[PDB]
Design a protein around this ligand. Structure first.
Ligand SMILES: CCCCCCCCCCCC(=O)O
Ligand SMILES: CCCCCCCCCCCC(=O)O
Lengths: 250, 269, 25, 237, 269, 237, 60, 25, 25, 25, 25
């Protein structure tokens, strides 16, 4: 039940885990010379970039339908990791995602926490439309399912969370690395994920590798006055490597 | 590839409950028949070969239907076709490959050319199919110089000939094909696999010189994957496809319709 | 060479591996 | 040259054939393979992963997350039936689960199914349920007595929120069709064994989640096209 | 054929400047990535086979399109074609071989005969293609005695038959073919390869006797080099070709146009 | 005779096939081979020879020898940009060089490019230049500061008139397309590091030549027809 | 390729022939055989079993 | 392999047994 | 004879070398 | 097997002797 | 058998010598 994960100068503790999941059974590791493409020495900032970064908390209420964040986008503003991300053409990283949500023994609810590779979102409308860059790059704020009028909507992604935002049934989302946070049992979910791509390193600004999706499968219910509780996400890059240094991209 | 045998099982009275677990962990249960019931010893004899990726994806399916309507008026000006190659335009094949995030395989292409007679006779018809990789000049007319095929690969079919067929090796500049791509252009445009999956075009022309018989030639293209590998399984597509390279599913003035069928009451199966 | 089956004869006739038939499991 | 004799079948195109063919790009050397986590080699690997069964498939909960949970009630003090489903892998509602979807690409199946349930009520809420499997040849049970006469598990929801029950392969033939006609492999029914009890000031209802996957047992044969997906029109480029 | 590996490299502070040289010498620099930057150790895995001459030139491309318009009026008087063989009339092939000064190889010739129906039916058509080396009598009519082919090589094709194909060994009286020739006649005429490249003619006739169906027969000839060798590389042709055996490039009332594209300002890529 | 089964593909003509065929001149004995210097065995040998880049490709210098040199100025006392070019082997102006021309007969490329510069001013003229390579993912630099933040060489033009700089392969994928769309491998820009200084009575400007060739690194694949040459009409016999 | 010579009979369909042909369901694994009493291997086994002769075959 | 007959040559060319010719008695 | 490839079977069927397929590199 | 002639190659391809070619004298 | 050439494979398939190809010199 007790976890303690130490990353840089950061340590996470959780007295109520469903022990951690290692996506696809592979622990993150630095890129091997046998798989490498680019020929310059990759810079490895170590503890200055491989540490836990806590994002802006979201509120879980009885009418919440879901949220998603994309990596590495969510960390583009995070200290040394964010800096390296934009000073270099190529980057590569694994992550430890720790989703935290505590309540009480008098609260009930269940979240599905999934990490999806190449989560190519569907657009909201019909016709010849596609999702605009800005909308799949919300930053640490992430995206929350709101079912109610946004803009240049021919550029917006779909809000059909029950179709995994991409035309497949929620429900089968379990085929992806995931954990459930069932309030009567745990107060956190931890997923360790390696780098997954069809190329050894890639552009972090242009390609998001993982999408983190959180969906309340069973609603938050309680008789307590504290009837909304936050969900906080802390993500730690792991084995971050960068290559192709030049000016910082704006 | 063998399925394990069902072993004999007895009545247990114990402190360890194999049936009891926590799915919050994101792990699938390990309970087998012997843990929950007093099981009989059965010697199962099933191979799992047919369920392999090679078997599943290694079947020829249609990926394109190329229609060439021969015009006799501007014989050299037209009478050729161009198609940007992809596996996104026909549902049966597309859905099978999209069960994975990344795939890698060699391709077998079989052509089924059918001449539709619109005149009294069909004469002698010969077709040329040329593979034009990105960057090579694309033909602009039936008599374009590009049809010389000095270095591109062309294949010829004439009425009476068996179905043409040839293999292509894994074509990507990456280590695997992207069945999905959460990314963009270097210009922040074209979200999706349109960026990653540029395999060039398949162009065709009727080679026979001007003649007097109107005909239409429909060449269906079949694709079979060979020596297959795939990574990161995904849930199967639950709705009709609407566009190539996009996961969009919304149709105008039409509600979302999945394959789930409703029932009146959940206490009756 | 000869292979067993779920015995038969089989050899490759082309110089490029993409030409080969289905893979052995 | 060598006298040869042409055999029937010659020149035909059989889509499930297995012959060699000349390569159009001779001498071409493909991109080296790099390590990508998550390789799949056989479809059974997918069939063995749990996925949620849309057990509450009524018009009311249909295009939402509610089709995936059942609500238990503390006001019920009786041996009532909570829900039931046919056991046939490709029948509804199992059809759209991972295992039901893969099964729909084959014609025959065999093996045992593992059904797991997760109780999502408060840590202070309790209940005991009767999960039962009724072998075929009889109508689905309408009373707890008739249900328990079959294969069953009595689940005590206490500190562990999950349980797994196995529906064993009990069939005359070694395999069954994935598309069953006037046929069944049986039913799974859920009943209140005791009652959903709660202390004061606790929500009076609680949800239950149901998952399904196949056991080591599981096997499919005779590949075919799926009936669970359509193309009624062209796909725009 | 393997490309070398990129080795690890470190920060140097030295008296020897590998980056500094003199190109006045006519020698290309030997600087590799490791000399100019702190390089990463990468294990490159590329074969260079496809870049070999055998691979580059060993592809079939069109070198001639022979059109025979069958006349029913003077059936035996005409209905035959003659073509002085050469690789100078079709640009794609010509440019590839002219990347070298001298080449030597065997030739594979594949024929693609197409009958164009100009009447209700095409009947039964049979063609004869005869190779006439320099000096052998060239046919003067469809019924010329030279078609007896007592010793010249002829190949026959009839409607329904697969594409004819045959090989020719390296044909020159010299040790290699001249792709370019800075020389003349023994009479101080005909500057160029017209002197050196006299391979005789390819003649054809419709063999079927007088019949009543008008047809045109277009036979395209494809050439593929085998067992190739080449010497003295040359810059690639930069302009359209205008004549066979001559490097002339001037076109009447038309400016010289290369493939270089201009830009407004050279400080913007 | 031997029972045989005809396979799909039979009878087709694939221009990139590799089969044997009967010889039309049986018994013919070809001319012996003699020694000819200059044999080439692989196209990479050509890609490795330096050729001049038509760096000054403006309408003013276009069909002459001037498109091949850049003029440096002693009147400029500032960190100005002298010229720039995309690094993509088959993009303009690199396209018509030896390596660009051979690359245009293939679809993919990989490897490092060697760029060399020759200073052609007086033996008494001096200058220091900044040659920089900007990896992709960003706009080409407009200031010396932004340029030098990338890969670069500071060239002191003294007694050696030439220098070589290597543009390393820095790409996500192992290969790139020779026909790039909305893509780039980066840029090479040239800047005044100091100033072109001359003694009295010396020409106030001087030219610079730029060459390109591939390193041991270089490789091309997937042969295709070139887009750099045309045939719009018949070639007269 | 290998020079071959086509023989008369080629391409015909003789209903009593005995050639191999490609399988339309590759990799398919049939149901195991179980023991069933009464296997017959040759028609003579049936010819050797007594059966009644309809010796009184009159219209009556 | 070679078999006697009521001697001839025979080998299997396909990977699935259903493809084989008539059974030996 | 048999050759490796970037294993396959290959022999020459004609008496003149010009008839042979592409050269081995 | 191989036979001399008034040397050549010859084997039987069918399972019934009636299928065989002319008899050796 | 196999023969060299100005190496290739060659055997006779018919029982009468008149059927054979060109003579070896
Ligand atoms: C020349 C015939 C067509 C060859 C098609 C094989 C290419 C498969 C590329 C897969 C990428 C995609 O479209 O999602
Ligand atoms: C009989 C079919 C045609 C054979 C063509 C091969 C001859 C190539 C001669 C090359 C000399 C030249 O034209 O520059």
């Amino acid at each position: 039940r007790i976890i303690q994960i130490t990353r840089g100068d950061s340590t996470i503790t959780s007295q109520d885990v469903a022990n951690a999941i290692v996506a696809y059974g592979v622990w993150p590791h630095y890129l091997s010379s046998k798989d490498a493409s680019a020929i310059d020495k990759p810079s490895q900032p170590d503890t200055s970039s491989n540490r836990f970064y806590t994002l802006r908390s979201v509120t879980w209420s009885s009418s919440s339908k879901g949220w998603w964040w994309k990596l590495p986008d969510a960390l583009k503003d995070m200290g040394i990791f964010g800096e390296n991300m934009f000073y270099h053409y190529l980057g590569r990283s694994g992550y430890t995602i720790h989703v935290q949500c505590n309540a009480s023994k008098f609260h009930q609810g269940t979240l599905i926490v999934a990490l999806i590779p190449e989560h190519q979102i569907a657009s909201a409308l019909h016709g010849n439309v596609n999702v605009g860059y800005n909308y799949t790059h919300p930053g640490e704020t992430g995206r929350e399912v709101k079912a109610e009028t946004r803009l240049n909507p021919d550029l917006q992604p779909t809000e059909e969370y029950w179709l995994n935002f991409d035309g497949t049934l929620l429900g089968n989302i379990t085929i992806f690395p995931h954990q459930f946070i069932n309030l009567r049992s745990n107060n956190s979910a931890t997923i360790i994920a390696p780098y997954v791509n069809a190329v050894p390193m890639d552009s972090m600004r242009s390609h998001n590798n993982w999408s983190l999706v959180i969906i309340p499968i069973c609603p938050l219910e309680t008789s307590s006055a504290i009837n909304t509780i936050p969900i906080t996400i802390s993500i730690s890059p792991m084995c971050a490597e960068f290559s192709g240094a030049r000016a910082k991209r704006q | 590839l063998v399925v394990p045998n069902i072993n004999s099982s007895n009545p247990t009275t114990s402190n360890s409950a194999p049936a009891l677990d926590a799915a919050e962990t994101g792990h699938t249960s390990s309970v087998q028949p012997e843990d929950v019931i007093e099981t009989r010893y059965v010697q199962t004899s099933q191979t799992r070969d047919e369920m392999s990726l090679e078997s599943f994806l290694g079947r020829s399916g249609c990926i394109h239907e190329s229609k060439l309507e021969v015009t006799l008026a501007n014989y050299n000006k037209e009478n050729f076709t161009v198609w940007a190659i992809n596996l996104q335009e026909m549902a049966q094949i597309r859905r099978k490959f999209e069960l994975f995030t990344y795939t890698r395989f060699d391709s077998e292409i079989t052509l089924v050319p059918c001449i539709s007679a619109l005149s009294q006779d069909i004469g002698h018809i010969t077709m040329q199919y040329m593979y034009v990789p990105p960057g090579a000049p694309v033909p602009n007319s039936r008599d374009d110089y590009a049809w010389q095929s000095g270095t591109n690969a062309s294949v010829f079919w004439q009425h009476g000939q068996a179905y043409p067929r040839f293999s292509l090796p894994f074509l990507s500049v990456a280590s695997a094909y992207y069945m999905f791509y959460d990314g963009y252009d270097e210009q922040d445009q074209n979200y999706g696999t349109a960026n990653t999956n540029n395999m060039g075009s398949l162009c065709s022309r009727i080679v026979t010189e001007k003649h007097i018989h109107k005909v239409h030639i429909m060449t269906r293209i079949y694709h079979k994957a060979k020596h297959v590998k795939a990574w990161c399984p995904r849930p199967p597509r639950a709705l009709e496809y609407t566009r190539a390279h996009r996961t969009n599913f919304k149709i105008e003035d039409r509600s979302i319709q999945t394959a789930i069928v409703t029932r009146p009451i959940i206490t009756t199966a | 060479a000869q292979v067993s089956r779920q015995n038969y004869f089989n050899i490759n006739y082309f110089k490029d591996a993409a030409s080969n038939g289905a893979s052995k499991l | 040259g060598l006298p040869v004799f042409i055999t029937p079948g010659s020149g035909q195109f059989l889509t499930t054939d297995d012959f060699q063919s000349p390569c159009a790009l001779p001498w071409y050397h493909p991109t080296k393979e790099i390590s990508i986590p998550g390789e799949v080699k056989n479809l059974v690997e997918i069939c063995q992963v749990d996925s949620l069964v849309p057990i509450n498939n009524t018009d009311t909960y249909i295009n939402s997350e509610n089709m995936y949970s059942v609500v238990l009630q503390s006001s019920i003090n009786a041996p009532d039936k909570i829900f039931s489903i046919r056991t046939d892998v490709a029948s509804q509602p199992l059809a759209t689960t991972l295992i039901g979807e893969i099964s729909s690409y084959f014609t025959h199946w065999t093996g045992s199914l593992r059904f797991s349930f997760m109780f999502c009520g408060t840590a202070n809420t309790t209940v005991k349920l009767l999960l039962a499997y009724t072998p075929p040849g009889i109508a689905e049970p309408t009373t707890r007595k008739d249900a328990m006469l079959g294969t069953h598990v009595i689940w005590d929801v206490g500190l562990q929120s999950t349980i797994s029950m196995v529906v064993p392969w009990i069939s005359a033939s070694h395999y069954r069709n994935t598309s069953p006609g006037r046929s069944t492999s049986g039913y799974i029914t859920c009943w209140y064994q005791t009652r959903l009890v709660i202390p004061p000031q606790t929500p009076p209802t609680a949800r239950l989640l149901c998952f399904v996957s196949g056991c080591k047992d599981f096997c499919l044969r005779m590949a075919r096209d799926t009936n669970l997906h359509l193309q009624s029109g062209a796909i725009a480029q």
